[PDB]
Amino acid sequence: KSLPADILYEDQQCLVFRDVAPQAPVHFLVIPKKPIPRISQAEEEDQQLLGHLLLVAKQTAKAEGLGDGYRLVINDGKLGAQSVYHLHIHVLGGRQLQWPPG
Amino acid sequence: APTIFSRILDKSLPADILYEDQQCLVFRDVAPQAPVHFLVIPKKPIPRISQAEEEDQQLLGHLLLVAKQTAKAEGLGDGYRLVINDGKLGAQSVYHLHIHVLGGRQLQWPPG
Ligand SMILES: Nc1ccn(C[C@@H](CO)OCP(=O)(O)O)c(=O)n1
Numbered sequence: 785k786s787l788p789a790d791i792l793y794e795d796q797q798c799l800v801f802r803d804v805a806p807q808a809p810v811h812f813l814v815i816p817k818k819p820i821p822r823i824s825q826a827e828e829e830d831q832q833l834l835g836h837l838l839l840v841a842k843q844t845a846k847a848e849g850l851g852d853g854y855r856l857v858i859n860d861g862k863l864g865a866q867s868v869y870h871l872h873i874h875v876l877g878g879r880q881l882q883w884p885p886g
Numbered sequence: 887a888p889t890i891f892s893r894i895l896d897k898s899l900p901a902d903i904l905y906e907d908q909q910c911l912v913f914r915d916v917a918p919q920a921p922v923h924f925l926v927i928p929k930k931p932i933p934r935i936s937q938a939e940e941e942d943q944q945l946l947g948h949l950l951l952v953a954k955q956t957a958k959a960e961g962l963g964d965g966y967r968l969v970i971n972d973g974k975l976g977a978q979s980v981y982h983l984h985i986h987v988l989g990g991r992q993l994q995w996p997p998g
């Protein structure tokens with residue numbers, strides 16, 4: 785059960801919030817307000833928005849002290865293990881992430 | 887300073903190139919972690935996503951659209967994962983920005 789403070793950032797285009805099931809000491813989520821259901825259904829008109837989401841993710845990673853490194857993840861469909869059909873960019877840090885990435 | 891990606895870009899190191907335009911290049915990963923594993927890289931030598939800037943917004947969006955379009959062309963219809971690694975903890979080993987696209991198998995959770 786999350787609190788309003790779990791929203792780390794918001795603007796006209798996107799929301800950033802903590803993952804209530806964190807896979808790392810820091811784990812948050814960047815989503816567009818426009819309900820793109822999955823990255824495979826993004827269209828060319830979404831180019832600037834998609835760019836903005838990545839920029840927001842990295843700015844927030846800095847704000848959350850992920851200077852020693854972090855991982856950005858976007859899941860698509862069943863094989864990507866996408867759990868909600870709204871676009872999510874995962875940002876994970878604060879521990880050594882492994883390889884392969886799942 | 888120049889990573890091995892500099893050779894892939896100038897074509898001195900042969901690669902299985904899936905797509906190219908003036909802004910980016912797409913090629914198969916030679917150490918694949920999935921049945922399909924390719925990389926989308928900018929031609930602009932951004933070393934890592936933490937060093938991208940506001941004027942790279944459009945380029946970053948373009949990289950994602952190219953990733954998704956190429957995923958389609960590779961038949962990743964049942965799904966796939968996009969990964970960007972930054973720095974040591976992210977397990978970044980090549981310091982030229984690149985998006986991994988992995989598909990053709992079930993991806994697990996957590997993502998590393
Ligand atoms: N068995 C392994 C071990 C390491 N790496 C390198 C990979 C993860 O460290 O590089 C991630 P990048 O810098 O985002 O390509 C690999 O490709 N295979």
Ligand SMILES: [Cl-]
Nearest residue numbers: 859866867872
């Ligand atoms: Cl997800």
